[PDB]
Design a binder for this molecule. Structure first.
Ligand SMILES: [Cl-]
Ligand SMILES: [Cl-]
Ligand SMILES: [Cl-]
Ligand SMILES: [Li+]
Ligand SMILES: [Mg+2]
Ligand SMILES: [Mg+2]
Length: 136
RNA sequence: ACAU
DNA sequence: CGATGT
């Protein structure tokens, strides 16, 4: 398995889980940050991974790009394939923002088409995904 | 068990 | 050590 360098890599980072969630997408080859979401006060790791992939799909579609997306999240790759994010996070006023984003991301997937391959980054062979946040 |  | 997920 060769890395597909002509691709977009996404990943989540957080302070607490559940906690403050952010995510970003980078050029897999150069590491250039192509988008980064403003921190969301309360969410889960998997919600952030999910939003990161969907944002990537929207980013590539808008730019007429056929590049694949790498994610390291087994969970979020499945959620995108299903068009359904099966998060356990409670719905309350503190989690309303992220739940609105998740609901809207599902809605986008149910109203648009894409051919973008969503690929599992093979961390065991390649090391950390290039969008990883690391340690604070 | 696997993945974050 | 615990949390989010299949
Ligand atoms: Cl978002
Ligand atoms: Cl997977
Ligand atoms: Cl591909
Ligand atoms: Li990740
Ligand atoms: Mg990471
Ligand atoms: Mg980390």
């Amino acid at each position: 398995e060769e890395i597909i360098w002509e691709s977009l890599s996404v990943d989540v980072g957080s302070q607490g889980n559940p906690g403050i969630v952010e995510y970003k997408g980078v050029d897999t080859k150069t590491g250039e940050v192509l988008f980064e979401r403003e921190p969301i006060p309360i969410g889960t790791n998997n919600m952030g991974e999910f939003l990161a992939i969907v944002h990537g799909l929207r980013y590539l579609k808008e730019r007429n790009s056929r590049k694949p997306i790498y994610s390291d999240s087994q969970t979020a790759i499945k959620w995108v394939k299903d068009k359904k994010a099966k998060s356990t996070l409670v719905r309350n006023e503190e989690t309303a923002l992220i739940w609105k984003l998740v609901d809207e991301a599902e809605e986008w997937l149910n109203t648009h088409t894409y051919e973008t391959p969503i690929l599992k980054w093979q961390t065991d062979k390649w090391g950390e995904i290039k969008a990883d946040y690391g340690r604070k």
